[PDB]
């Protein structure tokens, strides 16, 4: 299974990705997670990417494409993968098609998670993420079993530096301007399936599973 999840920030892509990659035993490839790891490590790349991220702007295309090319070239991607947060622009989608061609890989499905914009702010400002493994929770919609602690690794949960109201507004605007047009790009391939993300987490997952089956 070679899969892309599409949808606005806050739609539930990372949450569903965790469930999907457990179901299929494939890697979860998230460009945001790569950037956040770089920031945690204090790398030059991370520190520079953070400047864009904290403004709610996209990190530039070529650097992001190169990270994904390198990641998809690893042996653990030969038997499937899930892209979550890439592509974000038409240039990235075209570049991904070229990467996949070079690797001899064909996409199987593109899942577009639809959620009304009005739901997204509270999902995002209440999001809490694990420092050590990147697992995603929500203060009320999907809490950890123990407050402030990751269920998987025991790591501390935190609020991302971009999950504040001002920055959210800009991220949603960027999504509508740059990223929403990708729905048409993947519709043309005959791979796109739309999912109602305005449901509880397990109902959304059920619908994704049904669509992929």
Ligand X SMILES: Nc1ncnc2c1ncn2[C@@H]1O[C@H](COP(=O)(O)OP(=O)(O)O)[C@@H](O)[C@H]1O
Which positions are annotated as active-site residues?
Answer: 13, 88, 127, 160, 171
Of 20, 23, 193, 207, nearest in space to 111 by CA:
193
Interacting residue with ligand X among 105, 180, 201, 212 (CB under 6 A): 201
Residue 71 interacts with ligand X (CB under 6 A)? no
Residues forming the site for Zn ion (CB under 5 A): 130, 132-133, 135, 150, 152-153, 155
18 binds, among Zn ion, ligand X, none (CB under 5 to 8 A by kind): none
CB of 101 to ligand X, least distance (A): 19
Kindly state the tokens that stand for 150.
């990751």
30 by DSSP, 3-state: which?
A: coil
Q: Report how far apart, in Å, the C-alpha atoms of 8 and of each of 68, 77, 99, 192 are.
A: 20, 25, 24, 15
DSSP 8-state class, residue 206:
H
Q: How far is the CB of 72 from Zn ion (least distance, A)?
A: 24
CA pair distance 72, 96, nearest whole angstrom: 10
Nearer to ligand X, 10 or 150 (CB): 10
Segment 36 to 65, residues that bind ligand X, using CB under 6 A: 52-53, 56-59, 64
Residue 134 interacts with ligand X (CB under 6 A): yes or no: no
Buried b (16+ CB within 10 A) or exposed e, 46-57: bebbbeebeebe
Residue 137 contacts which entry, ligand X, Zn ion, none (Cβ below 5-8 A, type-dependent): ligand X
Question: Considering CB under 6 A, how many residues would be counted as binding ligand X?
Answer: 37
35 contacts ligand X (rule: CB under 6 A): yes
127 binds ligand X (CB under 6 A): yes
Task: Give CA–CA dist 204/180, Å, rounded.
Answer: 20
With respect to ligand X, which residue has the nearer C-beta, 104 or 202? 202
Give the sheet arrangement for strand 109-114, strand by strand: 28-29, 81-84, 2-6, 109-114, 192-196
Helix (H, G, I), strand (E, B) or coil at 6: strand
Q: Does residue 86 belong to the site contacting ligand X (CB under 6 A)?
A: yes
Among 2, 9, 39, 112, binds ligand X (CB under 6 A): 9
Handedness of CA 69, 70, 75, 77 (dihedral sign): negative
Residues that bind ligand X (CB under 6 A): 7, 9-15, 31-32, 35, 52-53, 56-59, 64, 85-86, 88, 92, 123, 126-127, 136-138, 141-142, 162, 171, 197, 199-201, 204
């Amino acid at each position: 299974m070679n899969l892309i999840l599409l949808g606005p920030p806050g739609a539930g892509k990372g949450t569903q990705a965790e469930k999907i990659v457990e179901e299929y035993g494939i890697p979860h490839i998230s460009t945001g997670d790569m950037f956040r790891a770089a920031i945690k490590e204090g790398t030059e790349l991370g520190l520079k990417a953070k400047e864009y991220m904290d403004k709610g702007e996209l990190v530039p295309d070529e650097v992001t494409i190169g990270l994904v090319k390198e990641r998809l070239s690893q042996p653990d991607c030969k038997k499937g993968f899930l892209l979550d947060g890439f592509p974000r622009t038409v240039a990235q989608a075209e570049a991904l098609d070229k990467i996949l061609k070079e690797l001899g890989i064909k996409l199987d499905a593109v899942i577009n998670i639809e959620v009304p914009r009005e739901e997204l702010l509270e999902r995002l400002t209440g999001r809490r993420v694990c420092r050590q493994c990147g697992a995603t929770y929500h203060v009320i919609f999907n809490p950890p079993k123990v407050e402030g602690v990751c269920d998987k690794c025991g790591g501390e949960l935190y609020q991302r530096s971009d999950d504040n109201e001002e920055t959210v507004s800009n991220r949603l605007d960027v999504y509508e301007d740059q990223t929403a047009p990708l729905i048409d790009y993947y519709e043309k391939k005959g791979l796109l399936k739309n999912i109602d993300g305005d449901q509880d987490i397990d109902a959304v997952f059920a619908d994704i599973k049904a669509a992929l089956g």
